[PDB]
A paper describes a structure:
Yeast SAGA is composed of 19 subunits, which are categorized into four modules, namely HAT (Gcn5, Ada2, Ada3, and Sgf29), DUB (Ubp8, Sgf11, Sgf73, and Sus1), TAF (Taf5, Taf6, Taf9, Taf10, and Taf12), and SPT (Tra1, Ada1, Spt3, Spt7, Spt8, and Spt20). The largest SAGA component Tra1 (3744 residues) in the SPT module was shown to directly interact with the acidic activation domain of TFs, such as VP16, GCN4, Gal4, and HAP44, which help recruit SAGA to promoter regions of target genes.
We successfully purified an endogenous SAGA complex that contains all 19 subunits from fermented S. cerevisiae cells after optimization of growth conditions. The structure of SAGA was determined by single-particle cryo-EM analysis at a resolution up to 6.9 Å. Tra1 is composed of HEAT (Finger, N-clasp, Ring, and C-clasp), FAT, FRB, PI3K/PI4K, and FATC domains from the N- to the C-terminus. We eventually generated an alanine-substituted structure of Tra1 consisting of alanine, glycine, and proline residues. Tra1 is characteristic of a helical solenoid fold and arranged into a “θ”-like structure, in which a Ring motif (1140–2442) within the HEAT domain forms the ring. Structural comparison of free Tra1 with its complex state revealed only regional conformational adjustments upon SAGA assembly, which reflects the structural rigidity of the solenoid fold of Tra1. In addition, the elongated ridge surface formed by FAT, PI3K/PI4K, C-Clasp, and Ring-C of Tra1 constitutes the major contact interface with lobe B.
Numbering used by the authors:
A (entry chain T): 1 to 18, 20 to 159, 214 to 258, 287 to 504, 511 to 522, 558 to 650, 676 to 763
B (entry chain T): 1665 to 1770, 1775 to 1794, 1796 to 1847, 1855 to 1960, 1964 to 2016, 2022 to 2041, 2089 to 2107, 2115 to 2130, ...
Write the structure that this text describes.
């Protein structure tokens, strides 16, 4: 600790070069400088030796241009201590000793260089940009020096800017211009000229790849700065390029690596985190350019599909300012199709639900419109249910598809719960007296291992919110009712106070819901909250037209009664539907008929089936 | 008209049994084209597109065609054609077809007839989804054959061709250009998963040739597939014979992790290698030294450390550089300064396992275990294995160490209970315990109960003996007499009960006769309703239950035994105490 170990180390390292142990002793000291056993405050002592020894190093292995076999291994010896420290105390004095060494290695950048230096440079920039003590303008000058050396090393010769991290003084009165040189370069010019060739050729695909991969890795970090000059900084009079630059960022992404997209995503999230750029761009952009070709690549990127969609979900959720009907039609089809894409993630689905329900309000808001536009808006309202019906009716039956295999999951969900699990009084008295993807799981090639969940509690949240958004949907459905004087309705308030019409398909859509959800209700092992959910489903179907309410009940009743033979909570569902004092005159009529058969065959039923009937 | 006729067909298909075309259906051809012809004019028109009027009817013919597919016997051709017609527009992905495939899968040589037909159909690349869903059928066919068998035995017991190796060596030689939805990678993973399936089979060198094409796949690196091909390599490597240079480099490849961590494979690849190399190390340690340099080359990666936690179970069985690993572990203990603790718990246990079969670092290990509690499980029990290890910073560096006081109350209790195994140390500990007199008192009751186990003698009766007992007991009375110290009185009662467990001797009984008196006052205060929320009753249940338990337990119901039963009648006025009086009679009956 600048002690008998450190004294014996530098003494045995008498000559600065020697053979393999000279590499080995070089690395191990920096490793303990990183990660020794203890630390009795030798860091200000060792750095007082180190910034000289680094000057002794930066003299010995000076520059760029492929100083490869021991000298970049000396730069590997240089890199291993280049950050192996912590900016705790006496940082600024040796930092000026480092600032000399930092400007010393500030140029040398190309042709096998940029390894030892950048590791030192972050260790300096973290200690520098924690403060704003104005020595970082020398760094920005050192930055702009290499930021001339880089288009020299790139644009003629046909890396790792961290420019926001370089500009982490968090004010930026020093203007954008140095980055805005590169910004207008990479954006307002297509930074590769093969890209206007390739983008015109679309409507790194050839072998000239690592250059485009360079130009992508450049513009990515160039985007990485641009939010730190957009989110805490407002620019003026530069507004036409930025959606096009977003369209340019939209146009290019290679997909060998993954954090490329992921940063660019969280960048676009930060780019979405702007407000007027949110206010301007989707009104101007045909955001259909952000198709499934926005997120493409590996099935690694399938894990990236949520935040990709979720930001796009956040996009229209912000951009819900009067999106046109055909545009809303694509919005429905894509996102409810994305919501139909239910094999991705429930939270993604549940979010996409709340997108659509908020979009339904926008469909309600803009749909309150032209009587010319109203039947298409009613067709949109028909499409709304056509989303909505098929939304649940797939997913709940998909959930019902799961429910059979969920017994085996219950055979596991109990099993992990099975695997989970007064002597003063007593002794004083004593001595003193699988036909699905379950088999696909059973394969030794697997990405993530098998998770675990309370699937009903998963389903109940699934069932609640989806029925919840269903509940307001039919509540809004009493708006696009036809003129009921076509049927000569004497109560023009009462007609169109509830449901007035539907398609024969839409009825057949609606009748499926009870045919789903009641059969859907089977998953309740050995509650009344779900009966309150069933009440909500009844309260949903309470908001309906009576002839349909008659007719579906006709189809419901045997399917009720046969399934009512399973369990008794359906009686509470019956108790619900009668007791509302609107559905009472209807639901009398069926059950009066529907019992009136079985009374004759009351002769021999089960005591259950008696009591069920009784 | 595109919809309405289809149900008009379907309602006729409903009524007629075999069919109204008698399971032949030339109109099924006239319809299947007409739907694509409806999909033709669909590309022209945009009135109510993606209608359920279509989409339900679209399901209907799909239901219809699948029904005839079950009804017919040509179990090759409509499979592709439907997948073709479903690739044509508006991809359904019929679970019914998945059910029918599940009906088709679960030897039928019709499956083998489909198998070469499968070898044909996905190789019949003409969309991607059409080829992809075939692979979905193909891998599932491949999996369910080997899974629902001993080992692929419908094919493993003389599949009557190398129809696989006809396709496989064709594929293994191909590697053609190594698919927007990673369909190539999907085809690769399918090729990988199939090759993972056939790795337990009879192909040795052709599989080693097929694993050589997998090395070209290991040469391919996009991040998911890269670890996957690394995962593919290890399952070959456990199965196939391995060069040592390949063995170290794969362990070096195992040392190369990534961001979206395929640790599941990496643990499984470890679960391959940690038998194999250690058995080979049993068969012979240069790999560990190269590993140790690589371990040195971790660059702050605790992913290496968690990998090393598994790897230390052979390595502590090896027991080569244990303190060097532990010196890394303290620097890793410095690095986290609860994941590292379990690693420290494993590493302590590993060090415990060899030495049972420095202590200052073990003392510093206890300092982190206390500091892990103070910045807020197993770590109490890990201190207990550390207690059995440190009895295979002395006691005093925690004079300041609420929740921190309570955690140290538990910690000093286990510290005392272990180091007990004394007669001067414990009053000196009671000197420290009198110093730190800040429930936590219930934890102090557990410490006193640990002190009560220490207060057990076994041959020390009137040998010198009770200042520590008396100083607590008056302090038990004084704390009780003040206000609201009911549980504190009970702890002092439990102390006095431990004291009665220790001693055959009234001076406890006179506050205790005051106690059941004050509990009787507290009973009438608590039975002022003839039924509060939950707690103060059940405490004063158990408080009086202990208070009852002792006052009878020795002998000599006192001169105010007349005051004693006066509470007992007010107890009989209350509604509780089923077992308690039932015992209390039984000894009094005795």
């Amino acid at each position: 600790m600048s002690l008998t170990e450190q004294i014996e180390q530098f003494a045995s390292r008498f000559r600065d070069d020697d053979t393999l142990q000279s590499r080995y002793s070089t690395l191990s000291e920096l490793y303990d400088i990183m990660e020794l056993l203890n630390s009795p405050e030798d860091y200000h002592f060792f750095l007082q030796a180190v910034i000289p020894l680094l000057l002794n190093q930066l003299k010995e292995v000076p520059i760029s241009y492929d100083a490869h076999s021991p000298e970049q291994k000396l730069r590997n010896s240089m890199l291993d201590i280049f950050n192996r420290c912590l900016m705790n105390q006496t940082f600024q004095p040796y930092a000026m000793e480092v600032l000399e060494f930092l400007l010393s290695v500030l140029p040398k950048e190309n042709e096998e260089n940029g390894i030892l230096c950048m590791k030192v440079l972050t260790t300096l920039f973290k200690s520098f940009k924690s403060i704003l003590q104005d020595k970082l303008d020398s760094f920005i000058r050192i930055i702009i020096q290499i930021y001339k050396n880089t288009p020299n090393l790139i644009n003629q010769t046909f890396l790792r800017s961290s420019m926001f991290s370089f500009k982490i003084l968090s004010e930026c009165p020093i203007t954008m211009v140095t980055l805005y040189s590169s910004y207008k370069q990479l954006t307002s010019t297509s930074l590769p000229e093969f890209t206007p060739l390739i983008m015109n050729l679309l409507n790194n695909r050839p072998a000239y790849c690592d250059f485009i991969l360079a130009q992508i890795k450049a513009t990515s970090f160039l985007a990485y700065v641009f939010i730190r000059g957009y989110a805490p900084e407002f620019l003026q009079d530069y507004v036409n390029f930025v959606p096009d630059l977003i369209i340019r960022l939209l146009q290019d992404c290679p997909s060998e690596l993954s954090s490329a997209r992921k940063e660019l995503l969280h960048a676009t999230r930060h780019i979405l985190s702007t407000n007027y750029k949110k206010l301007f761009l989707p009104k101007l952009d045909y955001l259909f350019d952000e198709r499934i070709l926005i997120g493409n690549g590996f099935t690694m990127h399938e894990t990236l599909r949520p935040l990709a969609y979720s930001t796009v979900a956040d996009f229209i959720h912000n951009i819900r300012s009067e999106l046109q009907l055909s545009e809303i039609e694509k919005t429905i089809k894509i996102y409810t199709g994305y919501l139909l894409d239910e094999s991705l993630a429930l939270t993604v689905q549940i979010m996409s639900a709340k997108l659509l329900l908020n979009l339904v309000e926008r469909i309600l808001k803009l749909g309150k419109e032209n009587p010319q536009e109203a039947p298409r808006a009613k067709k949109l309202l028909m499409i709304i249910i056509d989303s909505y019906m098929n939304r649940f009716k797939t997913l709940n039956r998909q959930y019902d598809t799961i429910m059979k295999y969920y017994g085996r999951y219950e055979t596991h969900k109990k099993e992990k719960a099975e695997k989970l699990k007064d002597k003063e009084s007593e002794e004083f008295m004593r001595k003193v007296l699988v036909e699905m993807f379950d088999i696909k799981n059973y394969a030794p090639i697997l990405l993530l291992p098998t998770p675990t969940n309370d699937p009903i509690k998963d389903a109940f949240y699934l069932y609640r919110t989806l029925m919840s958004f269903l509940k307001t949907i039919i509540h809004d459905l009493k708006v696009f009712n036809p003129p009921p004087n076509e049927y000569t309705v004497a109560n023009p308030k009462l007609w169109a106070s509830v449901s007035r019409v539907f398609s024969y398909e839409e009825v057949i859509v609606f009748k499926d819901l009870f045919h789903e959800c009641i059969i859907g209700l089977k998953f309740f092992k050995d509650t009344k909250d779900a009966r309150e959910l069933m009440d909500y489903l009844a309260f949903m179907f309470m908001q309906m037209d009576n002839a349909t309410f008659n007719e579906i009940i006709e189809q419901e009743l045997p399917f009720v009664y046969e399934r009512m033979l399973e369990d008794s909570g359906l009686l509470h569902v019956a108790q619900s539907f009668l007791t509302s004092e609107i559905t009472s005159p209807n639901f009398a009529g069926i059950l009066l008929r529907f019992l009136k058969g079985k009374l004759k065959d009351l002769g021999n039923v089960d005591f259950n089936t008696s009591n069920v009937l009784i | 008209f595109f919809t309405n006729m289809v149900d008009l067909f379907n309602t006729m298909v409903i009524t007629n049994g075999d069919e109204w075309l008698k399971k032949k259906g030339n109109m099924i051809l006239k319809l299947k084209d007409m739907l694509n012809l409806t999909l033709k004019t669909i590309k022209e028109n945009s009135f109510y597109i993606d209608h359920l009027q279509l989409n339900q009817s679209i399901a209907k013919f799909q239901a219809l065609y699948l029904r005839f597919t079950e009804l017919s016997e040509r179990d090759q051709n409509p499979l592709l054609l439907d997948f073709i017609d479903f690739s044509f527009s508006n991809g359904i992905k019929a679970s019914y077809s998945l059910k029918k495939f599940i009906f088709h899968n679960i030897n039928k040589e019709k499956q083998n007839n489909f198998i070469n037909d499968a070898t044909l159909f996905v190789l019949s690349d003409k969309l991607d989804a059409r080829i992809f869903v075939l692979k979905n059928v193909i891998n599932s066919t491949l999996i369910y054959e080997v899974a629902t068998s001993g080992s692929l035995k419908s094919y493993l017991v003389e599949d009557k061709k190398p129809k696989w190796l006809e396709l496989l060596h064709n594929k293994i030689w191909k590697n053609s250009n190594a698919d927007h939805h990673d369909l190539f990678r999907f085809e690769l993973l399918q090729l990988s998963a199939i090759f993972i399936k056939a790795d337990p089979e009879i192909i040795a060198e052709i599989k080693k040739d097929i694993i050589k094409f997998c090395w070209n796949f290991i040469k391919l690196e996009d991040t998911l597939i890269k670890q996957s091909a690394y995962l593919v390599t290890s399952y070959f490597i456990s199965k196939f014979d391995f060069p040592i240079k390949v063995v170290t480099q794969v362990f070096v490849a195992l040392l190369r992790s990534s961001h979206v961590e395929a640790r599941y494979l990496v643990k499984q690849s470890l679960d391959v290698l940690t038998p194999v190399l250690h058995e080979r190390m049993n068969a012979a340690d240069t790999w560990i030294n190269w590993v140790k340099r690589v371990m040195v080359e971790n660059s702050s990666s605790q992913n290496n450390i968690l990998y090393q936690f598994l790897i230390s179970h052979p390595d502590l069985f090896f027991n080569s550089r244990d303190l060097f690993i532990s010196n890394i572990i303290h620097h890793m203990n410095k690095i986290t300064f609860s994941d590292s603790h379990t690693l420290a718990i494993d590493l302590a246990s590993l060090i415990l396992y060899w030495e049972n079969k420095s202590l200052h670092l073990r003392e510093a290990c206890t300092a982190f275990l206390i500091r892990y509690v103070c910045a807020s499980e197993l770590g109490l029990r890990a201190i207990n294995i550390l207690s059995e290890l440190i009895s295979d910073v002395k006691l005093v560096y925690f004079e300041k160490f609420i929740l921190y006081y309570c955690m140290n109350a538990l910690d000093v209790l286990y510290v005392f209970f272990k180091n007990k195994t004394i007669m001067e140390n414990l009053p000196t500990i009671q000197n420290l315990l009198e110093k730190c007199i800040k429930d936590v008192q219930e934890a102090l009751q557990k410490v006193l109960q640990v002190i009560m186990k220490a207060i057990k003698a076994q041959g020390v009766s009137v040998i010198i003996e009770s200042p520590g007992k008396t100083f607590i007991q008056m302090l038990t009375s004084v704390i009780t007499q003040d206000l609201q110290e009911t549980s504190s009185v009970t702890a002092g009662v439990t102390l006095a009960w431990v004291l009665f467990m220790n001693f055959p001797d009234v001076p406890l009984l006179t506050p205790l006769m005051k106690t059941f008196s004050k509990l009787c006052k507290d009973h009438l205060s608590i039975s002022q309703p003839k039924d509060a929320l939950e707690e103060a009753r059940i405490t004063t249940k158990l408080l009086e239950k202990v208070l009852y338990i002792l006052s009878l337990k020795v002998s000599l119901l006192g001169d105010s035994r007349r005051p004693f039963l006066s509470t007992v009648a007010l107890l009989i006025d209350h509604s509780m105490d089923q077992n308690f009086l039932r015992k209390i009679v039984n000894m009094s009956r005795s």
